[model samples]
Target: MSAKDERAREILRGFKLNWMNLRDAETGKILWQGTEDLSVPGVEHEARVPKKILKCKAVSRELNFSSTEQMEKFRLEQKVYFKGQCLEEWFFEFGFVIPNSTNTWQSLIEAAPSQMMPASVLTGNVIIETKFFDDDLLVSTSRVRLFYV
Candidate 1:
């Protein structure tokens, strides 16, 4: 990576590495939303949303990952949290870890939770998304949640 690209990565990687609320594109509805707080590692991120987000989408702004392992770990945690909603399967298809590079920022969307695998048993109404980062190479992960109501 060029020096210029490296500098940009440094700035964004810090500011963007946190949980956020997910909103609808056209209806202006909160499809899913999260609480803001400093994270503590090893806690299962908790969330509460209406169980009616069947056809809504999961949307995110520009997101970047500085390491392959970090994003990979985040992906695994998210899958268990969203297991019953089929959101986990959707993430598997689209939410790939960028794998440590300058080309990290990505704007992505998973349209409709029903498009993916079906859950044999329904789980929670809320879902978790984790944020993991290197605090100067010391790993720190925090759990964050998104609500549907």
Candidate 2:
């Protein structure tokens, strides 16, 4: 498998994430040599190990539009605070579209604040939310993981 595919599997390898571990046992003795197995030994005894829970901090942001005025082109600025220090300040714009009676429209905006850090140092709690609007004030939000030092 590709490294990316392996990493993807590793990311979701926790019990809470619906992943489990496999082990091989023999003669009533635990047989796995390490946390990760290169190959499973063929034997009558097989075991599965559940992943442990992780503890980390999480951060999120929310934007809401009550009317079309808010839907117009605009800029959003947010300050990120981590461990009592200002870690980052985000600035972005939105001024894309507005749906009319029978017509429809949609938009997508993505941001990656972690171009400076490796993925291993980042926690899973950081995410972005995008919401769209309609006459009945329809709103849809998508969750995306973001990173910071």
Candidate 3:
């Protein structure tokens, strides 16, 4: 769908998390409306000791492009952190055009790192950030209730 704005889409380059939802591992149920600090439905139902999944949609001010060349010039990025430590940096989008609705973006999901302890309790202050560029002034944030069996 076209955006309802008069501003030129030239410099309107950027992307952010339109909506983020945590999904129940067992039944694939949506946990809540929105996650500000995450870990809310922590006590709702403990997952069966596995990685957690999420449903997320991304939005961009520069989606209506005339050519794919413009798409090549931009990329969406993700920064994930757990327990106040950098877990990993993900650059998921390069030649991708993110739509507003549907599963436009892959939700951030994870379990205990395989590097060290594999079957440990994976719980922490999880933070996922979205941005259009490496130096974008405004970045989007999605906090997930980071807890698992």
Candidate 4:
């Protein structure tokens, strides 16, 4: 009987790389998402929104992670790309031991990308990837939304 359905158990430590999704709020849709096995190195949870037009003002993006020490000094990075360039990047780290962390995307652009012409079409796909120091929980489950112009 159980074979007709599915079940899941969360991890406290040591688990395989799982799937991911780029979700949209209210609409409850997966904008774009993907995953891979742990057999490869130099990896990340990558979700790509194909290139197109938009009427933009600001963006509310976000994601989550589940990993244990794993390490004591590990950090995370969220990379957003456009026009084959790393147009946006962020580095996150802390000394705490919490097993999970999440982020909210505020501000359409932070830091500065001298090449961005925000009022016009970008003419390229948006590649947003959440990469941890080693890019682990990374392998774990996460949810996200998207934006572009």
Highest lDDT against the true fold, candidate: 1
Model 3, 1-149: lDDT tens digits are 23413211332423323444455545655543332322222232222323333222222221222221123334556565555666667554434343332223334344334224232434544544444432332222334434434
Candidate 4 per-residue lDDT over residues 47-142, each given as its tens digit: 335332132222223323344333454445666566456776766664344454432222222344233555344433454554444323342323
- Output the better candidate (3/4) by lDDT: 4
lDDT of each: 0.42, 0.30, 0.37, 0.40
TM-score, per-candidate, Cα-based? 0.41, 0.25, 0.37, 0.38
Best by TM-score: 1
User: Which clashing pairs does model 1 show?
Assistant: 33-147, 49-148
Worst 10 contiguous positions by lDDT, candidate 2: 49-58
RMSD of each candidate relative to the true structure: 9.3, 21.0, 10.6, 10.9
Runs in model 1 lying further than 4 Å from the true structure? 1-19, 60-107, 111-120, 125-138, 142-149
Ranking according to lDDT, highest score first: 1, 4, 3, 2
**Which stretches of model 4 miss by more than 4 angstroms?**
1-64, 68-70, 98-115, 134-149
Ranking by TM-score: 1, 4, 3, 2
Clashes of 2: 1
- Candidate 4 Cα deviation (angstroms), residue 85: 1.7
Q: lDDT at 7 for candidate 2?
A: 37
The local distance difference test score of model 1 is 0.42
Q: Is candidate 1 or candidate 2 better by lDDT?
A: 1
- Separate clash counts for every candidate: 2, 1, 1, 0
lDDT of 1 by residue, 83-147 (tens): 43425423322233454533334344555434343222333443455433233222344554444
